[PDB]
Symmetry: C2
Subunit: 245 residues, 2 copies
């Protein structure tokens, strides 16, 4: 009887649904999300791989959107680096164990569980390199997102309602530590006092811009685009401001 | 006067908005999407890089969603391959030129435009290897998606309304040509006549499944998961069906 088998296999997930603050309408999707290929006791649903595939693109979008909207106004290169750093199996594995996913993971592999235990312990200590990252932990962080998406009738909004609280602190930490965009940094410091002049074309086919910072003087930047020129000029102004005479 | 400069730079985009069947509320976003780093005449908006970043994740999600929902029920490995094949700068560049994006692209690079012309010509002939792919064409296929998203008030639905007609035929072509999932293929052929038995555990810690195809006999599959076992059994049944005695 499939429902009796479901009831057996989902025993203990109550605690997990409370922890993430989401109640599954269809528990089969939650079981599927946590079912590794090796979990032969699950004779009623697919393993997590399809959900992982969907969840990967869902998280890529929600994380990308967040990065793009960040009022730090990261440059394209910084956005790219941040996306690579965050949309990432290791980062996903770290967040999975932070939020106890390993306590609900379904697999038959003593060796995998040993790797998981060591990784959980390391991450706990780290958060109060020769630790192997259990890729399945990253996998189920993704597959659960896919499961919530499916269970909620394909709602990205419901997914992010659940995932944002888990992700935002790490996203914010990474976003706060990457190099600042020199334009936004200057304007944080001198919002009405830093003024960029119109772009001018150079003999060598570049763009030159001057930023004047009232009380500090004028600083020139050149680059292969207006964006790069502004950045260059701001970086110079910032250096003078920091030097403080 | 910024609006006079906008009016000048967007001259000719009328034809493009008609072609994609989307009217921008804010033309600045359309200009930005098509503005390469080298286009120094654009002194009023950013270049396309930020939009490209956002658009990349938007298309990754919409394409992934489509692949996942395809009633061909691709296996995880096939889904992965298809995503890699489709969410791809070369594929994006080919679709951009198919839909005339190169006629509206803003750049200052005779050499780039030469590469573009050769690529347009090749693709036209192909669609009635030693052709360089102009990466900027893939870039603006992505940045325009980001621009439509922004202009429509962050609507994925409006993006896909515009993009689906451009993408679905290529997605469908790739999806139709990849290896079929043997389970779905068998069930297309024998929907009421192919029946999978319950999973059984093997001495070596695998799963074994038999599929019985009425009129043809029984075929066994073994694998490291229930999913793989079913696939294996179906592949055998298919081979017999095709042989047709």
């Amino acid at each position: 009887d499939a429902e009796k088998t479901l009831n057996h296999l989902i025993s203990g997930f109550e605690t997990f649904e409370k922890k993430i603050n989401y109640r599954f309408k269809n528990k089969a999707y939650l079981l599927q999300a946590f079912t590794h290929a090796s979990y032969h006791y699950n004779t009623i649903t697919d393993c997590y791989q399809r959900l992982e595939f969907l969840g990967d693109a869902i998280l890529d979008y929600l994380i990308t959107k967040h990065l793009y909207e960040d009022p730090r106004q990261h440059s394209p290169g910084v956005l790219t680096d941040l996306r690579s750093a965050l949309v990432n199996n290791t980062i996903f594995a770290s967040l999975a164990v932070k939020y106890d996913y390993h306590k609900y993971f379904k697999a038959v592999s003593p060796e995998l569980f040993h790797v998981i235990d060591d990784f959980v312990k390391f991450q706990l200590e780290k958060n109060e390199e020769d630790i192997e990252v259990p890729k399945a932990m990253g996998d189920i962080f993704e597959s659960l997102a896919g499961a919530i998406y499916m269970d909620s009738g394909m709602s990205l909004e419901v997914v992010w309602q659940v995932y944002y609280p888990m992700m935002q602190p790490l996203i914010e930490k990474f976003s706060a530590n990457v190099p600042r965009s020199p334009v936004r940094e200057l304007l944080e410091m001198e919002p009405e006092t830093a003024k960029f002049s119109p772009a001018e074309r150079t003999y060598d086919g570049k763009v030159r811009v001057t930023v004047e910072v009232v009380g500090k003087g004028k600083f020139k930047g050149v680059g292969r685009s207006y964006r790069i020129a502004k950045s260059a000029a701001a970086r110079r102004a910032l250096r003078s401001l920091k030097a403080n005479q």
